[PDB]
Design a protein around this ligand. Sequence first.
Ligand SMILES: O=C(NCc1ccc(Cn2c(C(F)(F)F)nc3ccccc32)s1)[C@H](O)[C@@H](O)C(=O)N1CCC[C@@H]1c1cccc(Cl)c1
Ligand SMILES: [Zn+2]
Length: 251
Amino acid sequence: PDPMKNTCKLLVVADHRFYRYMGRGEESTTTNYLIELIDRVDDIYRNTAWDNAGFKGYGIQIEQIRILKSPQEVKPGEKHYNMAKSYPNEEKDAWDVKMLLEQFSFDIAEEASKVCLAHLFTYQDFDMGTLGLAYGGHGGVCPKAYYSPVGKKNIYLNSGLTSTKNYGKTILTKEADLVTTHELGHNFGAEHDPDGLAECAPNEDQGGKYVMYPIAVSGDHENNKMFSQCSKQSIYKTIESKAQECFQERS
Ligand SMILES: O=C(NCc1ccc(Cn2c(C(F)(F)F)nc3ccccc32)s1)[C@H](O)[C@@H](O)C(=O)N1CCC[C@@H]1c1cccc(Cl)c1
Ligand SMILES: [Zn+2]
């Protein structure tokens, strides 16, 4: 491990929904929530031995927090991830998750090119219990250009998002930590843990599921906060390939 190239710096964005419903319309409350969450998620990453040996001490650090206090004014037929209305169905509380991630990546392209990852924190009730989305596991850590034919410019796939609202209520902080861990897990290169690999998807008596399980099943079992051997193997290759590219020294 290179201690000079072990941290993935983050651009953290809180939208107007997050600022209002999680930040109680205050900058201090918004930022304190995000600062503590990322630090707790960083403890999971930094304490993980990706090769089950000495390849550890890799994590994340906030470089900047962009706080969007109010909705983005849009011209007719124009869209933006921070606009007041959901897209494609404005009658719904939330965007289609995949479209929101594409939109966020488009709008944040200039800033995303200068950071290891960009993460959007929102407060919207996605359909069928979805809590987040991210690129990787193409995309993930270190900006990789994608020419958007619709958008007519390069966008970067070093992005992900977390919503702290599910089924009409604010999720617990212990649950939000797992969402962000999981989405950043995809950014770091991990796929979902499959049922066919018992080592990677244990029973409840064996400590439960690991963080990369596709379903936010529990939140109270030991393994829930940890990466499976399947995730470690995938992430191990990514860090080996990407740390030199965009990782920095821990501040
Ligand atoms: O919303 C998602 N995950 C959130 C989580 C799943 C499990 C996590 C941790 N976790 C666990 C526990 F797992 F530890 F138990 N118990 C938890 C209890 C509370 C909170 C978190 C918890 S967070 C999607 O996976 C998304 O990232 C994705 O890839 N998606 C989204 C759409 C397309 C694609 C997609 C692609 C293929 C299949 C699906 Cl389901 C979705
Ligand atoms: Zn996932």
